[PDB]
Amino acid sequence: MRIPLVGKDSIESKDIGFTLIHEHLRVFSEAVRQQWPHLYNEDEEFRNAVNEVKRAMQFGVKTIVDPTVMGLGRDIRFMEKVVKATGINLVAGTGIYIYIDLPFYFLNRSIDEIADLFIHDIKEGIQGTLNKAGFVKIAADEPGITKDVEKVIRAAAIANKETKVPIITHSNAHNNTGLEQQRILTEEGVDPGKILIGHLGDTDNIDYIKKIADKGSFIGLDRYGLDLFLPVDKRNETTLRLIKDGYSDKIMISHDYCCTIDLGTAKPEYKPKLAPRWSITLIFEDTIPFLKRNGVNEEVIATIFKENPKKFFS
Amino acid sequence: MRIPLVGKDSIESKDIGFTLIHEHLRVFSEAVRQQWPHLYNEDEEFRNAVNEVKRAMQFGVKTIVDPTVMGLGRDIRFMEKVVKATGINLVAGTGIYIYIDLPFYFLNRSIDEIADLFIHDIKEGIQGTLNKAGFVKIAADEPGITKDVEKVIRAAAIANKETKVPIITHSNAHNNTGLEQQRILTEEGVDPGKILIGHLGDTDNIDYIKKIADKGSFIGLDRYGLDLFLPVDKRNETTLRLIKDGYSDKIMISHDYCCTIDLGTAKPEYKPKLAPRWSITLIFEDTIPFLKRNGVNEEVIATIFKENPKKFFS
Ligand SMILES: [Co+2]
Ligand SMILES: [Co+2]
Ligand SMILES: [Fe+2]
Ligand SMILES: [Fe+2]
């Protein structure tokens, strides 16, 4: 189907090669950064991002999909810089990120009005730019599938139909929000194969993850490093298993790393003694080497990091 | 010099002239305007802002307090273009406007680290400018007093103590959220006379109102025009009753008009019927004349619109 890149003539589905499916160059709360720019440092952030991408490309990473959308502080101009300064393939997406309600702006507005916003970022461009969204991100968490949360999921379903672009979800692995995102998206006509249920690696309940995969969707083991949601040695033990059961065709791995996080749980103070080894290369340093160590083979890891992302964007 | 102004030198608590205590030059959602700027037209917004501000001046309005803060789309620089085009005593403020929870950025952070933000705008400047904040605005609505909501309130108190600036609040006149904000600010040291429970004019329940006034806190009859919450005539009737009971010295009147409201509930087409007369000079055309006509002398009004504000910023 061909995919739009941040500041590039665009590439074809089959030519994305080794790609990381959930990585944030930078995340912040639009509101806070707009009212207190003194808290942030573009230069310090820009560099932290450059070091990651380049040294992530050194490992062979050819494409990076960044699910940073509204609520996370998407910035197409910042992302465009990183591209010019690295040459990496960035796939920017659209959508909305919320756990409970929508900004007051969305009061008594139709799901169609929302989908329009997504379709705009896909057809027209992003933030007055020519860069187009190659997907749509949606979220759900502890609060569950709330009213406004469901409205976004449906707005996503429409955008998919109208554009054919895939969907990436943030979910809570413990409250079945992921399975619900799948139920709704499927009921609305979305192709399960065009759905990636995220943050499923945050659990070791193999029986639940399989239920989502058996329905034909991708299961997102996409938080290597964040030891707060699940230790690495226990995540690897989980991924290594779904692989033994032949679920590679639905397995997607990433870090969900944020070269720069304004989160109170990501301060330049906590990380050290919370999620130490949490880099955009944690998989090459541990995961992958571990898998090969358990006799997986290059074919399988090629499936997870090349074939899957390929089927996903086509 | 003790009360900050946008694009002007500070002034004394006095010579503030006829003032509108609660008016918005324009409101919007930080997140939405960033991600989808195609939804807004600054050219138009600017013309309307300057437009209204002028007519206000034509009626003797010398000062306007704009309680637009985080969540409502505060833009100091935009306010400058309005002041320079009118030369109005526009007072800017700091604070956070939420109904339920804070942006993930505040997750973990303490009520103390939040107060530090307001103080920056009060001492240093708003969004990296010499423009100081003359007050703090907190909010609470239908959802009630949530954890995050309460955190913001207590933070507001801290700021008042070290800065001396008053607090303008937003509440729901139907769920005691206003009284709560009152029983939570005074305790933190804040001087009751330095508070202003707003949106009390949205109800005809005289008992509920008098209760807040009977505690040294200013009552906010500040939504003239917004018939959705209460018709003009029924408001005029309510304010008159309060005056006829000596609650004059504690009464503050305004429109809470959004020369450019982002809410989807105030669409361009659904204007008439919902808030036809709604403007920033609706009180000079209706309210005031009504009052005079009903035994309220010129001194009282000068008390409500001139002195009361003074006491507020002292
Ligand atoms: Co997520
Ligand atoms: Co209000
Ligand atoms: Fe993420
Ligand atoms: Fe207001």
DSSP tag of B200: G
In a 13 Å sphere around the CA of B263, the CA atoms on its Cβ side amount to 10
SS (H, E, C) chain A: CCEEECCEEEECHHHCCCEECCCECCECCHHHHHHCHHHCCHHHHHHHHHHHHHHHHCCCCCEEEECCCECCCCCHHHHHHHHHCCCCEEEECEEECCCCCCCHHHCCCCHHHHHHHHHHHHHCCCCCCCCCCCCEEEECECCECCHHHHHHHHHHHHHHHHHCCCEEEECCCCCCHHHHHHHHHHHCCCCHHHEEECCCCCCCCHHHHHHHHCCCCEEEECCCCCCCCCCHHHHHHHHHHHCCCCCHHHEEECCCCECCECCCCCCCCCHHHCCCCCCCCHHHHHHHHHHHHCCCCHHHHHHHHHHHHHHHCC
At B208, list the tokens.
């509920």
Torsion on CA atoms B111, B114, B116, B117, rounded to nearest 10? -160
Say how many Å lie between the CA of residue A40 and the centre of ligand 2: 29
B164 is in an annotated binding site: no
Query: B13 by DSSP, 3-state: which?
Result: coil
At B52, list the tokens.
């209204």
CA dist., res. B76 & res. A38, Å (int): 14
At B240, list the tokens.
């008159």
CA dist., res. B39 & res. B23, Å (int): 23
Compute φ and ψ for B234, nearest 5 degrees. -75, -25
Residue with tokens 């305007």: B33
CA dist., res. B86 & res. A118, Å (int): 39
- CB proximity B95 to A under 8 Å: no
* Chain A CA closest to residue B71: A31
Q: What is the DSSP string of B85-146?
A: TT--EEE--EEB--SS---GGGTT--HHHHHHHHHIIIII-TTSSS-----EEEE-BTTBS-
Amino acid type, A81: K
Say how many Å lie between the CA of residue A192 and the centre of ligand 1: 19
Instruction: List strands edge to edge, sheet with B251-253.
Output: B94-95, B136-139, B167-170, B195-198, B218-221, B251-253
Helix (H) or strand (E) holding B281: none
CA dist., res. A166 & res. A191, Å (int): 9
B183 C-beta neighbours (distance < 10 Å), count: 10
Min Cα distance B225 → chain A (Å) is 20
Which of A176, A230, A224 minimizes the C-alpha distance to A202? A230
| CA-derived radius of gyration, chain A | 18
At B143, list the tokens.
């959802």
Q: For residue B19, what are the CA distances in angstroms to A2, A152, B13, B64, B126?
A: 59, 42, 12, 6, 22
In a 13 Å sphere around the CA of B293, the CA atoms on its Cβ side amount to 9
Q: For residue B61, what are the CA distances in angstroms to B20, B23, B254?
A: 7, 12, 12
Mutant choice from B28, B29, B30, B35 vs A, greatest count of A C-beta within 10 A: B35
Query: B262 by DSSP, 3-state: which?
Result: coil
Technique used to solve these coordinates = X-ray
- CB proximity A71 to B under 8 Å: yes
Check: CB of residue B266 under 8 Å from CB of residue B274. yes
Helix (H) or strand (E) holding B8: strand B8-11
CA dist., res. B1 & res. A197, Å (int): 58
β-partners of residue A8 are A5
CA dist., res. B263 & res. B257, Å (int): 12
Q: For residue B163, what are the CA distances in angstroms to A139, B156, B170, B218?
A: 40, 11, 21, 20
B221 C-beta neighbours (distance < 10 Å), count: 27
Check: CB of residue A223 under 8 Å from CB of residue A229. yes
B199 is in an annotated binding site: yes
CA dist., res. B215 & res. B181, Å (int): 12
Which of A255, A265, A193 minimizes the C-alpha distance to A228? A265
Residue with tokens 């499916």: A21
Compute φ and ψ for B233, nearest 5 degrees. -55, -40
CA dist., res. A254 & res. A21, Å (int): 6
Check: CB of residue B252 under 8 Å from CB of residue B218. yes
B311 C-beta neighbours (distance < 10 Å), count: 15
Beta strands A218-221; A251-253: pairing state: parallel
Q: What angle do CA B140, B26, A106 make, to 5 degrees?
A: 60
Check: CB of residue B21 under 8 Å from CB of residue B309. yes
Dihedral class, residue B195 (left if φ above 0, else alpha if ψ from -120 to 50, else beta)? beta
Check: CB of residue B62 under 8 Å from CB of residue B17. yes
Min Cα distance B107 → chain A (Å) is 5
Check: CB of residue B201 under 8 Å from CB of residue B238. yes
Q: Which residues of B253-272 are buried (b: 16+ CB within 10 A; e: fewer)?
A: bbbbbbbbbbbeebeeeeee
Q: What angle do CA B143, B147, B148 make, to 5 degrees?
A: 90
CA dist., res. A54 & res. A67, Å (int): 19
Compute φ and ψ for B10, nearest 5 degrees. -60, 155
Q: For residue A14, what are the CA distances in angstroms to A308, A312, A314, B256?
A: 11, 10, 8, 56
CA dist., res. A101 & res. A119, Å (int): 21
CA dist., res. A92 & res. B81, Å (int): 34
* Long-range interactions of A233-238: CB distance < 8 A, separation 24+: A234/A204, A235/A201, A235/A287, A236/A286, A236/A287, A236/A290, A236/A291, A237/A204, A238/A201, A238/A203, A238/A204, A238/A206
Question: Taking the alpha carbons of B228, B233, B236, B238 in that order, is the dihedral positive or negative?
Answer: negative
CA dist., res. B280 & res. B223, Å (int): 10
DSSP tag of B5: E
CA dist., res. B250 & res. B108, Å (int): 38
> Which residues 9-28 in chain A show a CB within 8 A of chain B?
28
- State the ligand closest to the CA atom of B66: 4
Say yes or no for a CB contact (<8 Å) between B264 and A32.
Answer: no
**Which CATH superfamily includes the segment(s) B1-314?**
Metal-dependent hydrolases (3.20.20.140)
Check: CB of residue B69 under 8 Å from CB of residue B137. yes
Which of A77, A98, A63 minimizes the C-alpha distance to A26? A77
Min Cα distance A183 → chain B (Å) is 27
Torsion on CA atoms B95, B99, B102, B103, rounded to nearest 10? -100
* Chain A CA closest to residue B27: A105
Query: B225 by DSSP, 3-state: which?
Result: coil
**B30: nearest CB among A34, A121, A124:** A34
Question: Taking the alpha carbons of B136, A102, A32, B45 in that order, is the dihedral positive or negative?
Answer: negative
Cite the DSSP H helix spans in chain B.
30-35, 42-58, 76-83, 111-119, 147-163, 177-185, 206-213, 232-243, 282, 288-293, 298-302, 308-312
- The distance of Cα A185 from the centroid of its chain, to the nearest Å, equals 17
Say yes or no for a CB contact (<8 Å) between B69 and A35.
Answer: yes
* Chain B CA closest to residue A110: B264
Residue with tokens 């991100």: A137
The domain segmentation of chain B, as residue ranges, is 1-314
Check: CB of residue B28 under 8 Å from CB of residue B266. no
CA dist., res. A168 & res. A135, Å (int): 7
Chain A hits for B107, Cβ within 8 Å? 263-265
Min Cα distance B185 → chain A (Å) is 23
β-partners of residue B251 are B219
Q: For residue A125, what are the CA distances in angstroms to A105, A117, A149, A166?
A: 21, 10, 24, 17
Chain A hits for B109, Cβ within 8 Å? 264
Q: For residue A252, what are the CA distances in angstroms to A41, A52, A127, A248, A309?
A: 32, 20, 29, 8, 8
Which of A122, A46, A132 minimizes the C-alpha distance to A85? A46
Min Cα distance A288 → chain B (Å) is 32
B285 C-beta neighbours (distance < 10 Å), count: 12
Check: CB of residue A227 under 8 Å from CB of residue A205. no
Query: B280 by DSSP, 3-state: which?
Result: coil
Q: What angle do CA A265, A72, A148 make, to 5 degrees?
A: 110
| Burial of residue A87, with CB atoms counted within 10 A of its CB: 0-12 exposed, 13-18 middle, 19 or more buried | exposed
> Which residues 260-289 in chain A show a CB within 8 A of chain B?
262-265
DSSP tag of B305: I
Which of B97, B91, B54 minimizes the C-alpha distance to B199? B97
The resolution, in angstroms to one decimal, equals: 2.7
β-partners of residue A70 are A96
| Burial of residue A192, with CB atoms counted within 10 A of its CB: 0-12 exposed, 13-18 middle, 19 or more buried | middle
B43 C-beta neighbours (distance < 10 Å), count: 8
Which of B292, B312, B210, B173 minimizes the C-alpha distance to B252? B312
Which of A71, A22, A53, A19 minimizes the C-alpha distance to A259? A53
Say yes or no for a CB contact (<8 Å) between B29 and A100.
Answer: no
Check: CB of residue A25 under 8 Å from CB of residue A79. yes
| CA-derived radius of gyration, chain B | 18
Residue with tokens 């807040």: B212
